[PDB]
Every structure is written in C-alpha cells, then in structure tokens.
C-alpha cells in the first residue's frame, strides 16, 4: 500500500496517488512550479505564487504572526464614512472604554449606510494580512420603525483601485454584540457585483489599503452602533512566538523590487504605471545627482552637487548651470558682488542664453552681470570691496 499525502491528494488508486491541481510527486506531497504552502484545507493543495506578476519563485514566509489592535489607536483616529468616502465625520464618535467605540447620532447624517473607517495602522501595506483574519465585535440598534437593509457588506476593502466586500452569514441582532471573524482569503470576498474575488486582486488591494470599512448602519434608520475588540492579523520579521505566516508568499523578486510579494520598488527604483498589476519599478531619474527617490512618486531625495527639484533638474539658489547635463560640476556658485536686493540673504543668478551667468538680485546702484559696477548717480567700486551709495549722500 502507498500512503498518499492527506494534504495534496484528492484520492488513490491504492497504488497511485491523485493530486490536487498545484501538487506534484509520487505521494502528492510537493508544490508544483510557481506554487507554495501545501495544506489540507486548500482544494488546490498549494497557493500560486503571485509576486505582483514579476516572479514565479516564492515559498512560505518565515515572518511571525502578530495583531494590530483597535485599543492601540486613539478614539479620535476613528471615524464614520459612507462607502464612497465622500461623507465622513468624527462628530459623535466616543469611546466608553479602551478600544471600544460608540455612535448614537445618526440624525446628523444622510440617509445612506455608514461604516466605521479603521485608522492608518490598519491600512497601507497589509499583504502580510493574507491568510489571517480581521476580528471585531459589533452591536447595533435600529430606531423603532427602521426598514431592514438587504445584502449590505459587513466589510469593504479599498486599495489600488480595487473594491472588495465581505458579507456575513448573519446580520447582528438588535441590542446584542456579535463577534465576526473575517478571513483575508479570496473565497470570503467578492467584487460589488457579487463576482468572486481572485487571490491576485485581494493581494493587490491589501498591498495598498486606502480604506478598510466596517458596517455601522445595518438598517435604514439606525439608532446606535458600537464597535469593539478589533484585531487584524499581520506578519512581522521579528520572532513573536506565534505561528509563522505560512499563507504569506515570500517571493524571490527581480532587481528593482522588494517586499514579500515584490509589491514595493527597492532603493534606487520607482514606480512606472505600465499597466499590469501594480506596474513596474525602474531606476530613479535624477540627472546623475542622486541614486535615491520616493518609490511611488519618483521625487528625487538628497540631490547632490548643489541641485534641487523632483528630478534634481535645477541648480539651487546661489548657483547656476544646466543641472540636466548630469555632471558633479553642473552648478557653479553665483559670482555676484555686494549685498542682495530686498535686504535678502543670498544672491541669485541664472545661466544666460550665451552660456554665461547673469546676476538678477543686484542691489540698487549696482550694475553689470556680476553686480560689479555702480549705476549712474551712484558711486563706489564693488570689485574692490567698496559698496554703492547714491551721489550726494555720506560719505
């Protein structure tokens, strides 16, 4: 007899093992090419590596599980929002105990559903939340004649131009707290039109969470809404003593990418919108004056060689030249004599169209491109330290 692997086998001809879709080997105990994390619960045996489309090589993260807790945020950081995020308020939100929130002022809001909008520690890059859960407790009361609402999402996840919803199996009953456990697994989420979420789309949304909304209204005319015991799974590189985040892919990324799913541009690289998944990462364009830049916007950082601008494309105040040429000596200091105009502190000058500098903050009474002479009805010689005073005055 051959003992087929319970995790990766669909069944057995007694001497042959029949494998799940993403499983290989005699005993159906190995992940296929581009797959990882064999588990009995996965009908395919193993997850497909996604890696934001830039790699097929990955295995289970060694990062440890941890939780973002509601109680670790100030009450002021929570708010209510409509689904579209066009109508939001904190007015009326209070905390009757640590990480517990309460709202009972629906009369001030429009006739539409509202959601608790989780604050920033629950958003941003949460690819590591994949395979974990969002846990929370809700309690709600409607007004006396409130029409129930049908098929409203319990949770809405918005990120990277993707919207996904989770619907509960049961609505919370009036006046009594319901515990929910929402898995970050594609089977538990749908698009707004009720089409199933894909792994790819869930991961893309998780990688750049813009909003994570929990239903606060429930009925057409709510009286009271409460939220507590909020816990969101993540993973961290530090050892926590919890289980490792095996459902989280750790990709081998190509040059230019980092993060477990290759979801971030690496040092020296920045996002190009090139339109598959999140886009690509290409080298910073800093005209040779920096090798570092904002990963998502491209804005160069710590421009060298007395340059500045989003692509280090300009010489700083007090210098001149063509910073786009790309050399360390693009920008030379301004050869301007005397004190600046408008009692200002630095001289400015620019590279004129003849290839030579022209000073454009000379003092009154100063003439010439270097502020080097004095103007008619003025006297002095700035090239020899002397300033310009008007004829007739002292000395």
Per-chain topology:
Blueprint (H helix, E strand, L loop, with lengths): L8 E4 L4 E3 L3 E2 L5 E2 L3 E2 L10 E2 L9 E3 L3 E6 L9 E3 L6 E2 L4 E4 L2 E4 L11 E3 L15 E10 L12 E5 L2 E5 L11 E6 L15 H8 L2 E7 L6 E15 L12 E3 L5 E2 L5 E2 L3 E4 L7 E4 L23 E2 L5 E2 L3 E2 L11 E2 L15 E3 L5 E3 L6 E2 L5 E2 L3 E2 L9 E2 L5
PDB class: structural protein
Keywords: Basement membrane proteins, perlecan;laminin IV-like, laminin EGF-like domains, structural protein
Assembly: monomeric
Notes on the protein architecture:
- A hairpin with a 5-residue loop joins strand 3 (23-24) and strand 4 (30-31).
- The protein has three domains: 1-48, Tie2 ligand-binding domain superfamily (Tie2 ligand-binding domain fold, Beta Complex), CATH 2.170.300; 67-236, Jelly Rolls; 334-395, Laminin (Ribbon).
- The strands form 13 sheets. Strands 8, 11, 12, 14, 17 and 19 form a six-stranded antiparallel beta sheet that branches.
- It has one helix at 199-206, and strands at 9-12, 17-19, 23-24, 30-31, 35-36, 47-48, 58-60, 64-69, 79-81, 88-89, 94-97, 100-103, 115-117, 133-142, 155-159, 162-166, 178-183, 209-215, 222-236, 249-251, 257-258, 264-265, 269-272, 280-283, 307-308, 314-315, 319-320, 332-333, 349-351, 357-359, 366-367, 373-374, 378-379, 389-390.
- It is built from one helix and 34 strands.
- It starts with 8 loop residues before the first strand and ends in a 5-residue tail after the last strand.
- By secondary structure, the chain is an all-beta fold.
- Disulfide bonds join 4-17, 19-28, 31-46, 284-293, 286-300, 303-312, 315-331, 334-349, 336-359, 362-371, 374-388.
- It comes from Mus musculus.
- Residues 4-48, 49-58, 251-283, 284-333, 334-390 form the Laminin EGF-like domain.
- Residues 66-250 form the Laminin IV type A domain.
- This is Basement membrane-specific heparan sulfate proteoglycan core protein.
């Amino acid at each position: 007899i051959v003992r087929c692997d319970e995790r990766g086998s669909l069944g057995t001809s007694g001497e042959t093992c029949r494998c799940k879709n993403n499983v290989v080997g005699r005993l159906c105990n190995e992940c296929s090419d581009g797959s990882f994390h064999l588990s009995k619960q996965n009908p395919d045996g193993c997850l497909k590596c996604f890696c934001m489309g830039v790699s097929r090589q990955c295995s289970s993260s060694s990062w440890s599980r941890a939780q973002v807790l509601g109680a670790s945020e100030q009450p002021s950081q929570f708010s209510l929002s409509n689904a579209a995020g066009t109508h939001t308020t904190s007015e009326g939100v209070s905390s009757p105990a640590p990480g517990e929130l309460s709202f009972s002022s629906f009369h001030n809001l429009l006739s539409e559903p509202y959601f608790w909008s989780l604050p920033a520690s629950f958003r941003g890059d949460k690819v590591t939340s994949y395979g974990g859960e969002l846990r929370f407790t809700v309690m709600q009361r409607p007004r006396p004649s409130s029409a129930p609402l049908h098929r409203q999402p319990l949770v809405v996840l918005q990120g990277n131009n993707i919207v996904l919803e989770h619907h509960a199996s049961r609505d919370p009953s009036p006046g009594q707290p319901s515990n929910f456990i929402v898995p970050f697994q594609e089977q538990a989420w749908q698009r707004p039109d009720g089409q199933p979420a894909t792994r790819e789309h869930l991961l893309m949304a998780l990688a750049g969470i813009d909003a994570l909304l929990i239903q606060a209204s429930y009925t057409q005319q709510p009286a009271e809404s409460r939220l507590s015991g909020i816990s969101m799974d993540v993973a961290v590189p530090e050892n926590t003593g919890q289980d490792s985040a095996r459902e989280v892919e750790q990709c081998t990324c190509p040059p230019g990418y980092r993060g477990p799913s290759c979801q971030d541009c690496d040092t020296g690289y920045t996002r190009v919108p090139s339109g598959l998944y999140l886009g690509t990462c290409e080298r910073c364009n800093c005209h040779g004056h920096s090798e570092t830049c904002e990963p998502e916007t491209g804005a160069c950082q710590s421009c060298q060689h007395h340059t500045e601008g989003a692509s280090c494309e300009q010489c700083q105040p007090g210098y001149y030249g063509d910073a786009q040429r790309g050399t360390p000596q693009d920008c030379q200091p301004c050869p301007c004599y005397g004190a600046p105009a408008a009692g200002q502190a630095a001289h400015t000058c620019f590279l004129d169209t003849d290839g030579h500098p022209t000073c454009d903050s000379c003092s009154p009474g100063h003439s010439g491109r270097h502020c080097e002479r004095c103007a008619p009805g003025y006297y002095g010689n700035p090239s020899q330290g002397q300033p310009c005073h008007r004829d007739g005055q002292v000395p």
